[PDB]
Design a protein around this ligand. Structure first.
Ligand SMILES: [Mg+2]
Ligand SMILES: [Mg+2]
Ligand SMILES: [Mg+2]
Ligand SMILES: [Mg+2]
Ligand SMILES: [Mg+2]
Ligand SMILES: [Mg+2]
Ligand SMILES: [Mg+2]
Ligand SMILES: [Mg+2]
Ligand SMILES: [Mg+2]
Ligand SMILES: [Mg+2]
Ligand SMILES: [Mg+2]
Ligand SMILES: [Mg+2]
Ligand SMILES: [Mg+2]
Ligand SMILES: [Mg+2]
Ligand SMILES: [Mg+2]
Ligand SMILES: [Mg+2]
Ligand SMILES: [Mg+2]
Ligand SMILES: [Mg+2]
Ligand SMILES: [Mg+2]
Ligand SMILES: [Mg+2]
Ligand SMILES: [Mg+2]
Ligand SMILES: [Mg+2]
Ligand SMILES: [Mg+2]
Ligand SMILES: [Mg+2]
Ligand SMILES: [Mg+2]
Ligand SMILES: [Mg+2]
Ligand SMILES: [Mg+2]
Ligand SMILES: [Mg+2]
Ligand SMILES: [Mg+2]
Ligand SMILES: [Mg+2]
Ligand SMILES: [Mg+2]
Ligand SMILES: [Mg+2]
Ligand SMILES: [Mg+2]
Ligand SMILES: [Mg+2]
Ligand SMILES: [Mg+2]
Ligand SMILES: [Mg+2]
Ligand SMILES: [Mg+2]
Ligand SMILES: [Mg+2]
Ligand SMILES: [Mg+2]
Ligand SMILES: [Mg+2]
Ligand SMILES: [Mg+2]
Ligand SMILES: [Mg+2]
Ligand SMILES: [Mg+2]
Ligand SMILES: [Mg+2]
Lengths: 181, 190, 166, 140, 103, 148, 95, 97
RNA sequence: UCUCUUACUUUUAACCAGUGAAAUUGACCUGCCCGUGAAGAGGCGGGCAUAACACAGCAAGACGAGAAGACCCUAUGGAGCU
RNA sequence: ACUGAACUCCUCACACCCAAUUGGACCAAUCUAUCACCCUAUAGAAGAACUAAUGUUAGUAUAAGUAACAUGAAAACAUUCU
RNA sequence: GCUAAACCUAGCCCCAAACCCCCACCUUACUACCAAACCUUAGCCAAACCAUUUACAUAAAGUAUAGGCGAUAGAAAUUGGGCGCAAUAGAUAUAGUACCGCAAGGGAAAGAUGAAAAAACCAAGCAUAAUAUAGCAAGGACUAACCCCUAUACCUUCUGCAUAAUGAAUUAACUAGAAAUAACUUUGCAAGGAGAGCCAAAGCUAAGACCCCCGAAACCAGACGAGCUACCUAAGAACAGCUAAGAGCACACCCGUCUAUGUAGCAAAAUAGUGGGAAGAUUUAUAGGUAGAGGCGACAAACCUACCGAGCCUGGUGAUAGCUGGUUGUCCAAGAUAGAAUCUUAGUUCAACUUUAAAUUUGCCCACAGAACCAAAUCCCCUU
């Protein structure tokens, strides 16, 4: 027995890295982890995108429908998402066609509608939503957040930005995050 | 370090038991050359450069430096607001619970070094109080030292003890070089 | 010493959902300290490593080696265990998925050589680990045909890029 | 043993983490690993002089390949793109030839016009007015 | 070396410079000991310059945890989910202020 | 330690060995420079500059006779009877600007240092002390604790 | 020399240094010239006068003899009638 | 694999022990105790180095001289062999001369 | 014995089954030619050759393994003898 | 004419390519003093760091499943035969 | 996933204190009983050989003296519990046991559950999972493992090593810089410093900081060995048959000529065939004797417990080695070749060169002029 403590401590922490390289844990969502304040991350969510929301109306854009059902289920042992998400999906469809009918006038309406279905599909929006911290802020039931719900949460953010700062700032939010895809 | 005597000793290759002859000849087999089975190389052999004997680390600083160190540690407890001067170390009761609350009320610290003047004339109340306390220590005035003034947060002197140190430490400044040690009788010293 | 192969028969999976295919049984079994070497056991363990358990007992009844008489005692106790303890209905519906051999704790004796010199003789021991999985044995991998070599070559031509430029 | 080494495991793994992709016992045995991990690090810094050498030799072999498509040799293209003060380096000229072959056909047309203006100035010795693409731009 | 270590292509996260520049930090998380000489500079960073830092970029949400640790860490989490946990152990105040601006 | 010679092995020859030739400290003939050195008498010199300086600072009291004890108690000269000091010699350095009516008893005294004390009205006498008698007159208190 | 004696544990001095050389307290060693009484009949009177001289030693010879003697031979010696008394102090050096 | 798998039991050190809280007391018993005792009279250890510091040769010379008359019979022979060895090492071997 | 060797038997052998050592060993993913070079190269230079793998022989090479060359010379190293 | 270096220029950064020797700045781990309290700080100390001694001891390789080793036959396993 | 790993307390080291402990057994020890001890240590080693010689409280003092006056040796008067180890460590110790040797003597290894048994992850090595042209095993790379391009393992020793020079299978653990005066740095105090002794013409006191590991053949002292063998003593034994006396042929026996096998062997000297003697100066069982400055010897300088130009063991002994090997974290900086002495040329001392710190003022390059009579250049040299 070599006497001492500092080398026996380091090996205890190199075993715990190998215990996660042999058996990695399941992913836990960000709100069940240390150093998380849900009110402070939303105000930081706005200023990150150089744009300003009405912070109560942005808070209702993240709470989904399946979350309210499973908040009443654990209550035996809030507005929904659908109103802001319907405004944001319907506007960003007419905003994206106005962007693409202006730049590509020769394209038919079949090919423009197939371009908006790409720019608002589950492959583009849920890739954009995971790199703007929308999965971290959304309130859902199951984790990792399914791409049918995370797309609803992303367009509720565009729907909340429409009521906050009008359709001029919101079209620049679609130009910088959806047309860059 | 001056009090330290380290009792570490290891057997060198001459005090280790056995190992007199060559184990195998110098040049027959294909093994290495060896002269005893108690070399520093061998398992069980002697230590090449281990600790040897009881070692003493005794040295004496010049006494004008050991006295200046007591002066230096007294200005520090005065400037850092850690020195407290009493008139007598006398308490109304000898409980530790009263003395511990008094240090917490006056915001002294966790560790107090109470320094009376003479060990045999210490009052009975402070002796039965501090004897059960770990971080409250009674020393006489002769037992003042730099190390225990730094281990304790506050230093509590008395008014005879303050005059004791001014007689003793200001004698080191303004004094002759010695002719023979001051344990011998001089004309004006003791 | 370690005995982790004996403890693999005690893992209890959660009870299955009906919207899920049926999990096959796994039966880990081993014999330790066989007086036989660990690399003479590998030729017998490599032989039976994909076979069904009835073909494995056939090819071991007629092998002349010493360990074939011992593996056949291991495979019979693990087949009797699968209908008794681990809930397999058919004895014949098993195949060997893993069949290996580790070394065991070996003893040391003295072998005398021709002069004052000698050697250190080691009495070899070995382990034999088997896993039976319930089911028909999977078919052996066929050699990849000339169609499959041509696809891989054309996919290697198709994947190349202009390297060290834009 | 008063103080012997308690952390020798982590000094071995400082070397052995670089050797994990080797062959033989160089990926496991420490004595064989340090003589190759050191040797794998010296080759890593001596090949910073060979990457810049082998890239320029590649660029020269991709400019020589594309200048031959227009009938130019390599010294007839570089030597006369300098004379028109077109200071494009080998990296762009080898990346113009692959990705923009119309612009590279214009640089082969320009380096051959200046070449013919260099011959016509050289056969007509004595004072003749300069060529059109042979006029230098002076900076002061 | 380069044949040992993985490699990648030069990319950005979501075409980070095309439309607008999005600050890519989400969080910084400081563990800072209250009593401890290893976090002497980390206590002076929180006292002096973490308030000047938390106003220079309001997208980063900063958590100072202040628990009894021997080694003070800084846990920078980014927008693509990556976590770069680094130590500010026994660093001066000018050395944490560039280590955080690098993050 | 160097390459493998006699330096790295650690077995160099003694100090003064010059490789085999007869060394420098042995090539030289013997001369009686230090022949009877432990029987030569030594006298610690006390200049009149130092004697005046001890008078003007209250360390040597000139209203009493200046013995060798009073020079040592005022710590103006320290003499060691081992290492063969036989006392204090008087030294003519500083004879001008010497102003003391003094009664001094040094062991040796030059002709001009006597003249510079007798001029100011003093008395110079030269006494003798054995090494046993000198070891008593310097530090008398470790003699009075000896019981003799 | 003996760096550590077996009785006391101090340095000894080479006593062949002492019977040959004289140390002045400035740091100089003083020696007689070799052969100053050998074969004087075959020497010219100029050569005989060079040998009858106390000469100083080198820098390295003085550092070798300083190691060969202890600190007893490096002290002030206030002899009565030392003829080498005036040579112990060093006047007027500019190093 | 010379590294332990479990981290050792925790070293609890009482910094307010008897020997720790009163450490250092009476080290200045000379300079403020009227010089009746030296602080070298406060150190407790072997007889031959109560107030004395030397190297290994000077310690064995002093141990043989002070306490060697009452040393054990093969501890005195192990000491005489050590002084016979350390004499030859310090006076004949080494780099500097 | 040889010119000038041949046949058979036994042991060994080789195969199968059991038991199971030793010297050795920098790492080896271990070619040939000519040149080079600490003056004789699997490894460097220029060529030539080149799917991967056992098993049996062989002894040209690995300056093959063994034994800190006994020859020789050196050491202000030993010893025997006269 | 082009090719062509660690030379030189370029963008940024610079204490960051000699043997023996010498000077200097740091430091792993340990114990001690006092702190610290998921593993540290400032100091004091010392059996304070091993890719090499035909090193020592233990484990395990390679040569190697190699060299080598063993039981007369039949049978009712009573017996008989060679 | 096998092999394995890990563990902490057995015990120990250094001090302080206190001065320790029924029966049988010197004959063949463990056996009931019958006619005289005292006598210098030597030698390695140091002297670079060796021959006289060489160490076995503080202070005076490394002083007086001694000495191939040289290596070195050296007084006296007088003065007066742990900044230890924690199963390769610490004792050799679980034990002076097992084992080894005729004997003296040498001398090991190792264990780990839990409150109660009356209850995983990590070395080497393998397996999971053999291999694809090409070459120090990598690097630059690359869409891509290889293919392409580049690259003569490491240590040591050297004028110079990929060298076909040394060492090394590999893993784990262990394994190698110990100190002086003087200087320097930093304090204290200062013509004085220092807790007596000592130094002092700025000194003095205290601290910090520099000096390795393994290895001979030997030499000496004291034991232990003549169960092998050399010779002797005592008292024994053995030698068929055939021909006619250290006779012949020939067994048993003893010896070992020659060949072959064997060469880590059956055997640390043997087997198979052949050969020499075999009633003698023979062979042999048993007990005794002679012992290492010696014994013994039909002299082979043979033999004396497997190695005898002088046994073996322990001790001096950590012998000595100018000779070989080894000399362990990181980074930076300066840094190469005149010579002289030497029982010396394998080494060392001094110089030269190198390094650091300090003080100062010139250094290098050089122009005229100048340097002897019987070629290239240099020396000297202000300017610059
Ligand atoms: Mg011994
Ligand atoms: Mg060998
Ligand atoms: Mg030897
Ligand atoms: Mg030991
Ligand atoms: Mg042992
Ligand atoms: Mg084996
Ligand atoms: Mg000579
Ligand atoms: Mg064969
Ligand atoms: Mg077989
Ligand atoms: Mg082996
Ligand atoms: Mg060749
Ligand atoms: Mg073959
Ligand atoms: Mg080779
Ligand atoms: Mg010689
Ligand atoms: Mg000799
Ligand atoms: Mg170039
Ligand atoms: Mg630079
Ligand atoms: Mg430290
Ligand atoms: Mg060490
Ligand atoms: Mg190691
Ligand atoms: Mg080794
Ligand atoms: Mg094998
Ligand atoms: Mg083979
Ligand atoms: Mg065979
Ligand atoms: Mg000698
Ligand atoms: Mg020598
Ligand atoms: Mg005496
Ligand atoms: Mg042990
Ligand atoms: Mg492994
Ligand atoms: Mg190649
Ligand atoms: Mg070369
Ligand atoms: Mg080699
Ligand atoms: Mg060599
Ligand atoms: Mg080898
Ligand atoms: Mg006999
Ligand atoms: Mg006869
Ligand atoms: Mg006959
Ligand atoms: Mg005979
Ligand atoms: Mg003869
Ligand atoms: Mg002869
Ligand atoms: Mg030696
Ligand atoms: Mg340099
Ligand atoms: Mg030599
Ligand atoms: Mg000049």
């Amino acid at each position: 027995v070599k006497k001492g403590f500092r080398a026996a401590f380091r090996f205890q922490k190199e075993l715990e890295r190998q215990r996660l390289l042999r058996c990695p844990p399941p992913p836990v969502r960000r709100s069940e982890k240390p150093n998380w304040d849900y009110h402070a991350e939303i105000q930081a969510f706005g200023h990150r995108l150089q744009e300003n929301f009405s912070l109560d109306l942005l808070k209702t854009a993240f709470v989904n429908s399946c979350y309210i059902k499973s908040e009443e289920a654990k209550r035996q042992q809030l507005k929904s998402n659908q109103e802001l998400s319907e405004q944001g999906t319907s506007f960003s469809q007419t905003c994206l066609t106005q962007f693409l009918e202006d730049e590509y006038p020769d394209m038919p309406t079949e090919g423009i509608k197939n371009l908006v279905d790409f720019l608002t599909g589950e492959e583009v929006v849920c890739h954009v939503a995971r790199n703007l911290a929308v999965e971290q802020l959304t309130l859902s039931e199951e984790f990792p957040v399914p791409p049918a719900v995370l797309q609803q949460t992303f367009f509720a953010v565009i729907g909340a930005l429409l009521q906050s700062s009008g359709p001029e700032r919101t079209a620049l939010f679609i130009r910088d995050f959806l047309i860059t895809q | 370090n001056f009090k330290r005597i380290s009792y570490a000793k290891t057997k060198t290759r001459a005090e280790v038991r056995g190992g007199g002859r060559k184990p195998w000849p110098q040049k027959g087999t294909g093994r290495a050359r060896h002269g005893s089975i108690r070399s520093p190389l061998w398992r069980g052999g002697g230590v090449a450069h281990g600790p040897r004997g009881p070692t003493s680390y005794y040295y004496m600083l010049p006494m004008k430096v050991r006295a200046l160190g007591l002066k230096v540690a007294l200005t520090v407890k005065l400037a850092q607001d850690d020195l407290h001067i009493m008139d007598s170390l006398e308490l109304p009761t000898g409980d530790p619970q009263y003395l511990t609350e008094l240090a917490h009320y006056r915001r002294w610290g966790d560790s107090v070094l109470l320094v009376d003047l003479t060990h045999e004339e210490m009052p009975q109340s402070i002796v039965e109080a501090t004897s059960r306390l770990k971080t409250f220590n009674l020393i006489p005035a002769v037992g003042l030292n730099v190390h225990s003034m730094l281990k304790h947060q506050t230093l509590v002197l008395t008014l005879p003890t303050v005059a004791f140190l001014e007689d003793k430490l200001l004698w080191q400044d303004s004094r002759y070089r010695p002719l023979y040690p001051f344990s011998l009788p001089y004309s004006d010293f003791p | 010493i370690s005995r982790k192969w004996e403890k693999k028969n005690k893992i209890v999976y959660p009870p299955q959902l009906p919207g899920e295919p049926r999990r096959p049984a796994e039966i880990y079994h081993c014999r330790r300290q066989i007086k036989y070497s660990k690399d003479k056991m590998w030729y017998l363990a490599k032989l039976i490593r994909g076979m069904s358990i009835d073909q494995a007992l056939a090819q071991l009844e007629f092998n002349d080696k010493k360990g074939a008489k011992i593996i056949k005692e291991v495979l019979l106790e693990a087949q009797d265990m699968a209908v008794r303890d681990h809930n397999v209905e058919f004895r014949s519906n098993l195949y060997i998925a893993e069949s290996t051999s580790g070394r065991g704790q070996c003893l040391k004796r003295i072998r005398y050589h021709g002069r004052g010199r000698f050697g250190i003789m080691e009495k070899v021991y070995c382990h034999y680990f088997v896993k039976l999985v319930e089911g028909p044995p999977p078919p052996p991998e066929p050699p990849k045909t000339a169609v499959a070599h041509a696809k891989e070559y054309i996919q290697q031509l198709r994947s190349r890029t202009i390297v060290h430029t834009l | 043993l008063r103080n012997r080494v308690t952390d020798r495991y982590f000094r071995i793994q400082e070397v052995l983490k670089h050797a994990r992709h080797f062959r033989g016992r160089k990926n496991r045995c420490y004595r064989l690993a340090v003589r190759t991990v050191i040797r794998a690090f010296v080759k890593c810094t001596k090949a910073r002089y060979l990457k810049k050498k082998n890239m320029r030799t590649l660029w020269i072999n991709r400019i020589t390949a594309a200048s031959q498509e227009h009938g130019l040799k390599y010294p007839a293209l570089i030597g006369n793109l300098v004379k028109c003060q077109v200071e494009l380096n080998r990296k762009v000229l080898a990346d113009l030839a692959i990705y923009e072959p119309k612009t590279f056909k214009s640089l082969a047309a320009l380096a051959s016009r200046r070449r013919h203006e260099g011959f016509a100035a050289a056969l007509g010795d004595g004072k003749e007015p300069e060529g059109i693409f042979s006029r230098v731009v002076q900076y002061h | 070396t380069a044949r040992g270590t993985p490699s990648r292509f030069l990319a950005s996260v979501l075409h980070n410079g095309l439309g607008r520049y999005v600050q890519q930090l989400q969080r910084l998380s400081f563990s800072v000991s209250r009593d401890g000489a290893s976090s002497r500079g980390a206590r002076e960073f929180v006292e002096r310059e973490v308030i000047d830092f938390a106003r220079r970029n309001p997208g980063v949400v900063i958590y100072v945890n202040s628990r009894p640790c021997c080694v003070p860490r800084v846990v920078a989490e980014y927008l693509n989910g990556a976590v770069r946990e680094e130590s500010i152990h026994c660093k001066s105040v000018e050395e944490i202020s560039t280590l955080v601006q690098k993050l | 330690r160097g390459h493998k010679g006699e330096r790295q092995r650690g077995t160099r020859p003694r100090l003064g060995f010059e490789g085999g030739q007869t060394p420098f400290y042995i090539r030289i003939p013997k001369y009686g420079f230090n022949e009877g050195h432990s029987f030569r008498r030594q006298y610690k010199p006390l200049s009149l500059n130092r004697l005046q300086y001890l008078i003007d600072l209250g360390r040597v009291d000139p209203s009493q006779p200046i013995d060798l004890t009073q020079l040592v108690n005022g710590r103006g000269v320290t003499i060691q009877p081992l290492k063969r000091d036989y006392g204090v010699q008087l030294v003519e350095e500083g004879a001008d600007t010497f102003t003391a009516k003094v009664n001094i008893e040094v062991q040796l005294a030059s002709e001009l240092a006597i003249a510079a004390i007798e001029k100011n009205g003093g008395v110079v006498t030269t006494a003798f002390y054995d090494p046993r008698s000198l070891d008593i007159v310097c530090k008398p208190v470790p003699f009075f604790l000896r019981g003799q | 020399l003996t760096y550590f004696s077996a009785r006391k544990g101090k340095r000894k001095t080479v006593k062949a240094v002492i019977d040959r050389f004289l140390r002045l307290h400035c740091g100089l060693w003083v020696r007689r010239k070799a052969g100053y009484k050998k074969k004087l009949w075959k020497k010219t009177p100029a050569r005989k006068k060079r040998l009858r001289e106390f000469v100083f030693c080198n820098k390295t010879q003085s550092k070798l003899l300083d190691k060969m003697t202890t600190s007893f031979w490096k002290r002030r010696n206030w002899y009565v009638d030392d003829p080498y008394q005036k040579y112990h102090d060093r006047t007027n050096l500019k190093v | 694999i010379g590294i332990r798998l479990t981290l050792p039991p925790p070293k609890v050190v009482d910094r307010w022990n008897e020997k720790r809280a009163m450490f250092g007391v009476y080290d200045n018993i000379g300079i403020l105790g009227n010089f009746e005792k030296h602080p070298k009279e406060l150190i407790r250890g072997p007889i031959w180095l109560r107030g004395w510091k030397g190297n290994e040769l000077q310690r064995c010379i002093r141990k043989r001289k002070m306490v060697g008359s009452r040393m054990f019979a093969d501890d005195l022979h192990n000491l005489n062999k050590r002084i016979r060895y350390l004499y030859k090492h310090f006076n004949r071997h080494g780099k500097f001369r």
